[PDB]
Amino acid sequence: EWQENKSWNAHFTEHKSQGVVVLWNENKQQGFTNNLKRANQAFLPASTFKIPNSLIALDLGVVKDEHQVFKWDGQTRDIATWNRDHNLITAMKYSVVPVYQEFARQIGEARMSKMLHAFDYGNEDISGNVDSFWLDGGIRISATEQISFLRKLYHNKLHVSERSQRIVKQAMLTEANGDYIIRAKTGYSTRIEPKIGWWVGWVELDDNVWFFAMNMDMPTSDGLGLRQAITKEVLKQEKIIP
Ligand SMILES: O=C(O)c1cccc(-c2ccc3ncccc3c2)c1
Ligand SMILES: [Cl-]
Hints:
The protein is of the alpha+beta class. The protein has 10 helices and 7 strands. The protein has a 7-stranded mixed beta sheet, with helices on both faces. Bound molecules: 3-quinolin-6-ylbenzoic acid (Q92) and chloride ion (CL). 3-quinolin-6-ylbenzoic acid binds at residues 47, 79, 95, 97, 186-188, 221, 224. One of its GO terms (cellular component) is plasma membrane. Its EC number is 3.5.2.6.
């Protein structure tokens, strides 16, 4: 069962923002959100799609391991961190689109489509460009669907090797200390309206896991830091992190 906690809206309103946060208590199998409607509204995954893309590239041998270097093609793009060599860890950390567009081309439409159906990922529709459908194509996914996919990955239940799933979960590592571990992936969709930011992942505790997925209206790149800020305020309010 799902519970709607509209008090979280305060964290969005304080920044004149609109969005949704969805949480899932794994131990209790209970979900919580500030907006049931938007939690079930499907959006472009944008760079959150690098989770399934990584999984598929690894399982098919397109990527040998997390150390294989993907060389910069020398074409200068306006994101400084993209103009250099990367491996799977750094490409994920810096959301390096062009590296993953190359992953997608080597996967191919047929294998990509079959894999996303096996993952039951979003609408499973890669209609459009094989290498950009997650940025301007037809694939859509909601916050609650993100959680369901993430839960399978955490439990190694996706239809790829255990090894592929362990490597991707390593690459998702975002923050860790004595209080919690966060494995997550950001997203920023700008080529189709409405422009939004994503943050999806989970919080590991000593004896529980809290999965989360949030998106928010992102008319300008200036509010990107709010994806994490708002999520952590919700996590603090719910006593999940200090
Ligand atoms: O957050 C992501 O996952 C992501 C993924 C791909 C691109 C960007 C991005 C693009 C333009 C920016 N322009 C200004 C400042 C920051 C910017 C970030 C972010
Ligand atoms: Cl790890």
